[PDB]
Design a protein around this ligand. Structure first.
Ligand code: SF4
Ligand code: SF4
Ligand code: FES
Lengths: 616, 617
C-alpha cells in the first residue's frame, strides 16, 4: 500500500508475499539505512592508497583530496555512467543503419526516408534530397560515426542550439566534441592526481552530459525514427491488464528497438502465429524504454514501468522476457525461475547469469527473433494455470507525440503553440523524466506533480516511466483536458491532444532539447529564456542524472525528487543548486514534496515569462 | 617510525624535516584512513544508482536492491577501476596525436619530428602508402589519421594489434577481447557497469581485459611511439638519481606528471640564452618527477629527483623553486606543501586543474612562449627562497637509462637472435618487467628493490619502468657495474653487452615497449606470448593505471604479480577468476603476494614452466 499507488501493483505485491517471492521493495528495506559516506558522496575507491572517507583527522584523502574534489569526482563518474548507457545505444543505431545501407540487414529497411533525407541535409550531406537513399544513409552514418570520433570541435546536432547558447558553451569550455571522447576524458579527470578542482570537474560533467543529450541520445532518437518510423499520435492501453490470459505473452524489456521491432514482426509471421498449443494469439507488451518506443511507433500496449517489471512476472502469465541492456534488474531471472517464464537476453553487452542468451544482431535478427518467439510459444504450454492472476483492466492512453507530430497538429509551424504561450493559455512546459525509486511510493510524486502542473496551465511532456504513471491516471487522453486549467484545456480541445504529451523513452528526451532549441531559435532567445522546466520526481539511475545534467546545462531548470550523493560537499551542492544559475542560466532543484516542486517549477517559468515581457 | 616508511636516507631526512616543520605527509594521511572501510576494501559496495547504495553481507544484504550479487558488484567496480586507468593513458595518447598533427600542419612552434626514421617506419607498419619516400609532414598527417581512427568507432581491431602473434590474435577474437577502439572500450565498460546491463561476472572480466588491451595496444602504444617520433627515440645514456639532483646554487624546476609535450619545452626554454642569463643564481636546474621525469631522463638524460612518495619530500627540502605539473598522479597536497615555502606550483593542462595553483595552460601552438613564461616564474621564485629552510639530503647516484626496444636491438647488433640465444642457453633464464609504484601500505621501495635483487640473482633480467626506476637506481642496479649483483649467466650477458642487469625502459606508458618486445620475441619464435619465459610485477602498486597495466599484461599472456590485492576479495568467484581462471582463458593469471621473496619464487616458477614448454633447461 505504501509501496505503490496502483491496485495492479498492490495485487501483485500481495501475490508475491503469499508465494514467498522477494521484491525490489523487500531488498530496499535491507539496504536502509545505507552507508552515510556513500550517501554523502564522501567516499573514494579510485586507488588502493585508499579507500578514503572524509570526516567533519580524515578531512582529506591520502593523496590530499578534500571533500569537494572527492564528491565532484564521484558525481562526474555517475554522469559518465549514464552518458555511456545512452552512448552505446546510439552507436548500436548507427551500426544498424549501416547494415541497412550496406544491404546486410534482412527485414530492416528505412521506414522514414523523408526524415533520413531531412536529417542528412541538416547535418551537411550533399544532395541528400535526391540521391539514392542507401547512399544518403551511408553518408549520414559517416557523420554520426565522426561524432563518435576524436577529430570534431563540436558534435553535429549542436547546431540546433541557438547561437547564444553555443557561444556560452564555448566560452565555458563545455562544447561536446565527441560522444565517447567526453566519457573517457571524464574517467581520465577522475583518476588520482588529475583534475583536483571541483568547478572544472562539474564543467566537464556538464560537457559529458551534453555529449549525451546532443550526441548519443539525439543520434539514437533520430536514427531510430529513420529505421523504425517517426511516431504519430495513436491510441493504446496501459497496465498489467495488457497481458492476456488466452494469449502467449512476450514482454520486451530494456532499450533496443532493433530487437523489439523484430520480435513484433516475427509474431506477425503466418507460420509463427499458426503455432497450436491453446493460444488465441501472440500478445506482445512493452516494458521500460523499448516498450515506450514500441508504443510510440507501433501502438503496442505497455505492461508497466520500472517497479512493475517484477510484478509483471508474478502475474503467472509472462511467458517470456526478451531483454537487451540497461535498467533490467537481475532479480528478474530469479523471479522468472519461480514460474515458467523464459528469460531471454539478446545483447552482447547485456549478459545475465542464468539467462537464455540468443544474441541478436542486424544480420541475424529475423531468424533469431523468430527463434525467440518459438521459445515463448513453447513456454506458454508449461504455464501453471493455478498460479495465474492478472490483476487490473487496461487503461486507454494516447501516444506518439514526436516533434514531427506536434508540429503537424499545429499546422506545420510552432507559431500557434508560441501564440498560446504569449497569450497565457499555456503558461509553460515541463518535461517530466522520472523513473521509479523504492524510496518513494510508486508514481505518487510523478502523478501528483503532473496533476498540479496541468492544473496551472503548464503542459507536461512525459518520457520514460512517467508514461505508465500518467497513463494509469487517465492523463494521456484528450478527455484529460478536464483536469487542466482553463487555458491549457482550451488549447488541448482545439488540438485534440491530451494535456500530457508522451514523447517516448529516456533516449527520446533529446526530443525535448530539439523542441526547446527550436522555440528558442524561432524567438531569437536562449533556451534559458524559455518558460520551460524538467523534473525527475522519482529518479534512480545514472541515465536520469545524465539527462538532468544536460537539461540544466542547456538552460532548462531541472527538479529532482531525491538528492544525488553530493551532500557531503556543500560547495558542490551549492554549485548544482545555485552556482550553475550564474554559469548556464539554469540550476538543480531538490524537493521531495511534489506540490512544492510544482511551486518551484512554476516560479521559474513565471520568471522567464517576465523576462520575455509576458504576463504569467 | 619513519624508518618504516621508506628504505632511503634522503626520504628519512625529509620526513624528519617534515615532522619538525609540522608538515603533514602522505604517510601521515595513510594512518588516518587505516583501518579503512571493510566493504570498500572487499569491493562489496555499490554506488551506481540511488536505489542504493548497497553493501553485500555474509540472510539480509546478500544482494543489491536491483538483485545484484557480490560477483556482479565486485566485477563492476573492478571494471570501472580498469576503465579509469585506461582513460588516463587514453587521453595522454590523444594529446600526442594532437601534437604531431600540429607539427604536421606547421602550427607548433618549437616542435619538430626528431625521429623521422621512426615516423616513416611506424607509418609504413600501420599501412601508410609510400611512407618511406614521401614528405615527412604528409607521412605524419597520414599516420595521425590512422591513430585518430583507433580513437574512433569503425575499426574491428586497433592498428598496433598486428604486432601480436597470430595465435594470440585468434584467441582474443574467439574470447571477445579484441580491442576495437580506445575510447570505445572505455565507454562500453561504463555502459556495462550501469544498473541492469551486464550482470555476468565473467563477461565483465572479459570486457575489462578488452578495455585494458585497448590501453596497452592502443592508448599507451600510440603514446610511446608518437613521443619517440616527436622527442627522439631513447638511446642508452648516463644520469643521476635521488633528491641530491637538486642543486642549492641553481634555479630548481621540477617537472611532474606525464606529458612530454610540456617538459621537453620546459627544458628548451631553460637552454635559451636570455632565460639562462636572467637566472642571481648559478644555473637553471631541471629535474624529473613521476613519468614525465622518466621520459626526460630517457630522451634527454635529465636527472630524476624521486618517485611517487618522494614528490612531497622534494618540496620539503626547501630548494624546489617551481613545480610544473600537467595531469595524473600529481597529489593535490603538493599545492599545500609548496605553500609552506616559496615554491610556485604551476599547472599546464586543461585536464589537470588543481584548486589554488598558478595555471599557465600549455598547448603546442603556444608552448614556446608559455614555457618561457613559466621558466621566468621559476627564476622569480629563486630569489624568494629562504636560505634557512634549505636542506638537500643525499649525494646523487649514477644511473644508466634510455633502453628502448630500438636501443636494445642496437646493442644486440640489430637482431634479437643474441638475446634469444642467451635464453636458450640459460644465461638469461627469463625476463620480468617490474611496473610498480609506491604505496604507503608498504615500506617505500623495499619490495621493489628486494624483488629486483632476487630476480637478477636468479639470472632473470629486469625491465624497469615507472617508479621502480628511481628505486633500483638508488640501489646502484642501473649501471653496468651492477652485473656483480646478478647470477653468473646474466652477469656474463651484461658484460658482453655493456648494459646493466636492470634495463630502464621508461614511464608507465612505455610499458607498451614491453608488449612490443614480447610480441617480437613470440613472433620470431612462432609461439604465443604465453609461451615466453616472461613475467610482470607491481610490488608496490596503487593506481588505476597500474591495474590497467597489470590487466593488459595478463590478457596478453604475461604472468603478472601484484604485491597488494585489488578491492575484489569480497567475491571469491572474481578472485578465483583473476588468480586461476584466467590461466585457462588467456594463458596467464594474477599472483598476489606481499612477500617479495615468495613473489620471486612465484615469478621464477612460471618462467621455469614456460622454459619447459619450450623444451629448455
Ligand atoms: S584517489 Fe585520493 S581520495 Fe581517492 S582513494 Fe586514492 S588516495 Fe584516497
Ligand atoms: S546498481 Fe544495484 S547494487 Fe548498485 S547501488 Fe543500484 S541497486 Fe544497489
Ligand atoms: S561502504 Fe565503504 S564507505 Fe560506504
Amino acid at each position: 500500500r505504501s509501496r505503490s499507488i496502483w491496485d495492479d501493483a498492490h495485487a501483485m505485491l500481495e501475490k508475491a508475499k503469499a508465494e514467498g517471492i522477494s521484491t525490489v521493495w523487500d531488498r530496499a528495506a535491507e539496504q536502509t539505512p545505507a552507508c552515510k559516506f556513500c550517501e554523502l558522496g564522501t567516499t573514494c575507491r579510485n586507488c588502493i592508497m585508499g579507500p578514503c572517507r572524509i570526516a567533519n583527522k580524515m578531512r582529506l584523502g591520502v593523496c590530499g583530496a578534500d571533500a569537494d574534489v572527492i564528491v565532484a569526482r564521484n558525481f562526474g563518474r555517475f554522469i559518465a555512467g549514464g552518458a555511456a548507457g545512452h552512448s552505446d545505444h546510439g552507436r548500436d543505431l548507427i551500426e544498424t543503419l549501416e547494415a541497412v545501407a550496406e544491404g546486410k540487414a534482412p527485414g530492416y529497411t528505412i521506414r522514414d526516408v523523408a526524415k533520413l533525407r531531412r536529417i542528412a541535409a541538416e547535418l551537411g550531406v550533399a544532395d541528400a534530397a535526391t540521391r539514392p537513399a542507401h547512399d544518403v544513409a551511408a553518408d549520414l552514418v559517416t557523420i554520426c560515426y565522426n561524432d563518435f570520433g576524436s577529430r570534431r570541435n563540436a558534435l553535429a546536432f549542436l547546431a540546433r542550439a541557438p547561437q547564444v547558447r553555443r557561444d556560452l558553451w564555448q566560452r565555458l569550455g563545455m562544447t561536446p566534441r565527441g560522444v565517447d571522447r567526453e566519457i573517457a576524458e571524464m574517467m581520465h579527470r577522475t583518476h588520482m592526481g588529475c583534475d583536483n578542482d571541483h568547478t572544472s570537474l562539474l564543467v566537464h560533467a556538464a560537457r559529458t552530459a551534453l555529449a549525451d543529450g546532443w550526441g548519443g541520445s539525439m543520434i539514437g532518437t533520430e536514427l531510430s525514427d529513420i529505421l523504425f518510423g517517426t511516431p504519430r499520435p495513436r491510441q493504446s492501453t496501459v497496465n498489467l491488464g495488457v497481458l492476456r490470459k488466452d494469449a502467449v505473452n512476450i514482454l520486451v524489456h530494456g532499450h533496443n528497438p532493433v530487437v523489439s521491432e523484430m520480435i513484433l514482426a516475427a509474431t506477425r509471421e503466418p507460420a509463427v502465429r499458426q503455432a497450436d498449443a491453446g493460444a488465441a494469439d501472440i500478445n506482445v507488451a512493452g516494458l521500460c524504454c523499448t516498450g515506450n518506443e514500441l508504443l510510440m511507433r507501433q501502438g503496442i500496449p505497455m505492461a508497466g514501468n520500472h517497479l512493475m517489471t517484477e510484478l509483471a512476472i508474478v502475474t503467472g502469465a509472462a511467458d517470456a522476457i526478451v531483454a537487451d541492456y540497461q535498467c533490467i534488474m537481475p532479480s528478474l531471472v530469479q523471479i522468472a525461475a519461480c514460474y515458467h517464464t523464459r528469460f531471454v537476453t539478446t545483447s552482447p553487452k547485456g549478459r545475465f547469469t542464468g539467462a537464455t542468451h540468443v544474441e541478436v544482431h542486424p544480420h541475424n535478427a529475423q531468424e533469431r527473433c523468430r527463434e525467440i518467439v518459438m521459445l515463448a510459444i513453447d513456454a506458454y504450454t508449461r504455464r501453471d494455470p493455478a498460479r495465474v492472476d492478472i490483476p487490473s483492466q487496461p487503461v486507454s492512453i494516447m501516444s506518439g507525440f514526436s516533434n514531427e507530430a506536434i508540429l503537424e497538429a499545429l499546422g506545420g509551424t510552432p507559431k500557434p503553440l508560441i501564440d498560446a504561450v504569449v497569450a497565457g493559455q499555456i503558461r509553460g512546459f515541463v518535461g517530466i523524466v522520472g523513473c521509479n525509486n523504492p524510496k518513494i511510493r510508486q508514481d505518487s510524486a510523478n502523478v501528483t506533480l503532473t496533476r498540479e502542473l496541468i492544473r496551472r496551465d503548464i503542459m507536461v511532456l512525459a518520457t520514460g516511466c512517467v508514461t505508465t504513471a500518467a497513463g494509469k491516471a487517465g492523463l494521456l487522453v484528450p478527455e484529460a483536458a478536464s483536469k487542466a486549467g482553463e487555458g491549457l484545456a482550451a488549447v488541448c480541445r482545439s488540438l485534440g491532444v491530451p494535456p500530457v504529451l508522451h514523447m517516448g523513452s529516456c533516449v527520446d528526451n533529446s526530443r525535448i532539447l530539439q523542441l526547446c532549441a527550436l522555440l528558442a531559435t524561432t524567438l531569437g532567445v536562449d533556451i534559458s529564456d524559455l518558460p520551460v522546466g524538467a523534473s525527475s520526481p522519482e529518479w534512480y539511475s545514472e541515465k536520469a542524472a545524465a539527462i538532468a545534467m544536460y537539461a540544466v546545462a542547456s538552460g532548462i531548470p531541472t527538479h529532482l525528487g531525491l538528492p544525488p550523493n553530493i551532500l557531503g560537499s556543500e560547495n558542490v551542492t551549492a554549485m548544482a543548486l545555485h552556482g550553475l544559475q550564474d554559469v548556464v542560466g539554469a540550476a538543480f532543484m531538490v524537493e521531495p514534496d511534489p506540490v512544492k516542486a510544482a511551486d518551484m517549477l512554476e516560479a521559474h517559468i513565471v520568471a522567464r515569462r517576465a523576462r520575455l515581457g509576458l504576463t504569467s
